[PDB]
């Protein structure tokens, strides 16, 4: 028995404690790189909270057993020159992840798919405690975001998935692929950066219109 609740920035420490236990260790990219201590990922994870559209799953004892951290994303201004997130990162391993994200954004702009949309919901970090996996918590976290979307006239939910494993969960929830890139094809300086196990395949950007 669990609740799905809005995350408050005062929940930050508890959210980070949970992420350090699971996501930091078991996201396919993190575990491949052996991420270790990563204050930059902590910073990254806390950033979307004040947008007031991130959700926690909480068990009967009051412990966080899942999160979906979401932020609002706005269409680039006409005069915008994009910034690389990787430029402001000192952590070498996390910088590789940010560089991959920058590369995806350089190759694919979600706002090109949806020319009429000014604001899109961006699902940034999804993580469920191992002992509570396979119970539909990911879906219930996602469903709470649909409520926020309805309340605010947002039509598109965008989620970058770092493995085919997680893309499949989003597919079950009614998302569809809008962009993909195999890890084997990601060669920013001529050589492969990421080679997790074969079933992960690569990144998939998933979208749903609600």
Ligand X SMILES: CC(=O)NCCc1ccccc1
134 is in an annotated binding site: yes
DSSP 3-state of 92: helix
What sections of the chain are H helices per DSSP? 12-21, 23-26, 28-33, 39-46, 92-107, 110-113, 137-152, 164-172
Residues 162, 194, 204, 208: which binds ligand X (CB under 6 A)? 162
**Minimum CB separation from ligand COA for residue 127, in Å?**
4
Can you name the residues that pair with 2 across neighbouring β-strands?
59
Binding mask 91-130 for ligand X (x = CB under 6 A): ------x-------------------------x-xx----
- Kindly give, in sequence order, each residue whose CB lies less than 8 Å from that of residue 32, ignoring residues fewer than 6 positions away: 194, 195, 196
128 is in an annotated binding site: yes
Dmax over CA atoms of the chain, in Å, equals 51
Positions touching ligand COA (CB under 6 A) are 22-23, 26-28, 126-128, 133-139, 161, 166, 169, 172
If contact means CB under 5 to 8 A according to the sort of partner, which of ligand COA, ligand X, none does residue 97 touch? ligand X
Cβ-in-10-Å burial (0-12, 13-18, 19+) of 142 comes to: buried
If contact means CB under 5 to 8 A according to the sort of partner, which of ligand X, ligand COA, none does residue 30 touch? ligand X
In sequence order, what DSSP letters do the residues of 21-61 get, joined into one string?
A: HTHHHHSHHHHHHT--S-HHHHHHHHTTGGGS--EEEEETT
**Minimum CB separation from ligand X for residue 162, in Å?**
4
**Minimum CB separation from ligand X for residue 112, in Å?**
21
If contact means CB under 5 to 8 A according to the sort of partner, which of ligand X, ligand COA, none does residue 172 touch? ligand COA
Q: φ and ψ at 63, to 5 degrees?
A: -90, 140
Instruction: Work out whether 27 is an interface residue with ligand X (CB under 6 A).
Output: yes
Residues in the site for ligand X, rule: CB under 6 A?
Answer: 27, 29-30, 97, 123, 125-126, 159-160, 162
Q: Which residues are annotated as a binding site for acetyl-CoA?
A: 126-128, 134-138
């Amino acid at each position: 028995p669990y609740t799905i609740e809005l995350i408050q920035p005062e929940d930050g420490e508890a959210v980070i404690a949970m992420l350090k236990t699971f996501f930091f260790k078991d996201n396919p990219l993190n575990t491949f790189l052996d991420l270790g201590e990563c204050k930059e990922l902590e910073k990254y994870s806390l950033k979307p909270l004040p947008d007031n559209c991130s959700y926690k799953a909480v068990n009967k004892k009051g412990e966080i057993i899942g999160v979906f951290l979401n932020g609002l994303m706005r269409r680039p201004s006409p005069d915008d020159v994009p910034e690389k997130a990787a430029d402001s990162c000192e952590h070498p391993k996390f910088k590789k992840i940010l560089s991959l994200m920058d590369h995806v954004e350089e190759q694919f702009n979600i706002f090109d798919v949806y020319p009429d949309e000014e604001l899109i919901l961006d699902g940034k970090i999804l993580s469920v405690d191992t002992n509570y996996r396979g119970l539909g918590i990911a879906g219930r976290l996602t469903e709470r975001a649909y409520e926020y979307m309805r309340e605010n006239g947002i039509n598109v939910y965008h989620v970058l998935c770092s493995s085919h494993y997680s893309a499949r969960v989003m597919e079950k929830l009614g998302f569809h692929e809008v962009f993909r890139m195999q890890f084997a094809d990601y060669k920013p300086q001529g050589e492969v950066v990421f080679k997790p196990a074969a079933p992960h395949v690569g990144i998939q950007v998933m979208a749903k219109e609600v």
